[PDB]
Design an enzyme around this catalytic site. Structure first.
Site, short mmCIF file in Angstrom:
data_model
loop_
_atom_site.label_atom_id
_atom_site.label_comp_id
_atom_site.label_asym_id
_atom_site.label_seq_id
_atom_site.Cartn_x
_atom_site.Cartn_y
_atom_site.Cartn_z
N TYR A 1 -72.71 -14.09 5.34
CA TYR A 1 -71.52 -13.30 5.61
C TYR A 1 -70.42 -13.98 6.40
O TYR A 1 -69.33 -13.44 6.39
CB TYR A 1 -71.87 -11.99 6.36
CG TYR A 1 -72.58 -11.04 5.45
CD1 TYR A 1 -73.96 -11.13 5.28
CD2 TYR A 1 -71.90 -10.07 4.74
CE1 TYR A 1 -74.62 -10.28 4.41
CE2 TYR A 1 -72.54 -9.21 3.87
CZ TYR A 1 -73.91 -9.33 3.72
OH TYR A 1 -74.55 -8.47 2.86
N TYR B 1 -63.27 -4.90 8.38
CA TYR B 1 -62.10 -5.22 7.57
C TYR B 1 -62.04 -4.31 6.34
O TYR B 1 -60.96 -3.94 5.91
CB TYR B 1 -62.04 -6.68 7.10
CG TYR B 1 -61.38 -7.67 8.05
CD1 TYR B 1 -61.08 -7.35 9.36
CD2 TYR B 1 -61.04 -8.94 7.61
CE1 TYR B 1 -60.47 -8.27 10.19
CE2 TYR B 1 -60.45 -9.87 8.44
CZ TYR B 1 -60.18 -9.53 9.74
OH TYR B 1 -59.55 -10.49 10.53
N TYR C 1 -51.08 -8.84 15.07
CA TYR C 1 -51.25 -7.82 16.08
C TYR C 1 -50.90 -8.35 17.46
O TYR C 1 -50.63 -9.53 17.63
CB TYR C 1 -52.69 -7.25 16.08
CG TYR C 1 -53.82 -8.25 15.97
CD1 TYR C 1 -54.15 -9.07 17.04
CD2 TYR C 1 -54.54 -8.39 14.79
CE1 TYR C 1 -55.14 -9.99 16.95
CE2 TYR C 1 -55.57 -9.31 14.70
CZ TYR C 1 -55.89 -10.09 15.80
OH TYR C 1 -56.89 -11.05 15.78
CA LIG Z 1 -67.37 -12.45 5.31
#
Ligand SMILES: [Ca+2]
Ligand SMILES: [Ca+2]
Lengths: 119, 119
Positions: A27, A51, A67
């Site tokens: 991941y 996300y 941001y």
């Molecule tokens: Ca990822």
């Protein structure tokens, strides 16, 4: 924005390059599937999920939305002057950089064989 | 959507697993920056740039947007049914699948060390 996420990772883990988290486990890095290989990989799985949820906000592009935040002596704070997208993305990034800073980094889990380990 | 892009690649490149492309170069999977290592990696850089243009259309999420397309004989066509987001994302996918078929595949450029090679 992605550059800020890199800077947050440098705020909480200045001993490492952001590239260390650019392809780690199943991941960490663009995309993700299969079973998380370790704690660090679990952080990335939760960051992709975060996300995913931020992308439900109309027009919200986590990789590009700039941001407002502060890195102060290793503390990350998302500031009040963020719209919904920015606030959500900032929070994803902040929580991931803190999660990464708590997880052990295993060099044998960097740049793994994704086909073999992530289905 | 990502499942459709996989099918397109299965179409123009029937000789390879889609995983052969999913972790190729600096751009085909993870990383997404640096100098493209070869022509196939440039195909991926262009695809990424194409998706980035597509995402400007609000609500348009290239990885998840289902479009209408056909793979016949090896020749991809995006159908005229597609709305704006669908038409754009289908074209990105089509162009990348054609590009993949035409570019030499170098085994040395699969699962590269992104930190070392994509700065
Ligand atoms: Ca990822
Ligand atoms: Ca890799």
């Amino acid at each position: 924005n992605r550059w800020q996420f890199k800077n947050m990772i440098s705020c909480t883990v200045p001993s490492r390059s952001w590239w260390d988290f650019a392809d780690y486990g199943c991941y960490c890095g663009r995309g993700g599937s299969g079973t998380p290989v370790d704690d660090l990989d679990r952080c990335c799985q939760v960051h992709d999920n975060c996300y995913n949820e931020a992308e439900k906000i109309s027009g919200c592009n986590p990789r590009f939305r700039t941001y407002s935040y502060e890195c102060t002596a290793g503390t990350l704070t998302c500031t009040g002057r963020n719209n919904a997208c920015a606030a959500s993305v900032c929070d994803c990034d902040r929580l991931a950089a803190i999660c990464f800073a708590g997880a052990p980094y295993n060099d044998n889990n960097y740049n793994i064989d994704l086909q073999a380990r992530c289905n | 959507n990502t499942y459709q892009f996989k099918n397109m690649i299965q179409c123009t490149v029937p000789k390879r697993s889609w995983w052969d492309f999913a972790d190729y170069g600096c751009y085909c999977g993870r990383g997404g920056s640096g100098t493209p290592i070869d022509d196939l990696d440039r195909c991926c850089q262009v695809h990424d740039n194409c998706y980035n243009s597509a995402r400007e259309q609000g609500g348009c999420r290239p990885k998840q947007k289902t479009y209408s397309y056909e793979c016949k004989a090896g020749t991809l066509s995006c159908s005229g049914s597609n709305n704006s987001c669908a038409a754009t994302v289908c074209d990105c996918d089509r162009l990348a699948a054609i590009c993949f078929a035409g570019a030499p595949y170098n085994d040395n450029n699969y699962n590269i060390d992104l930190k070392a090679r994509c700065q």
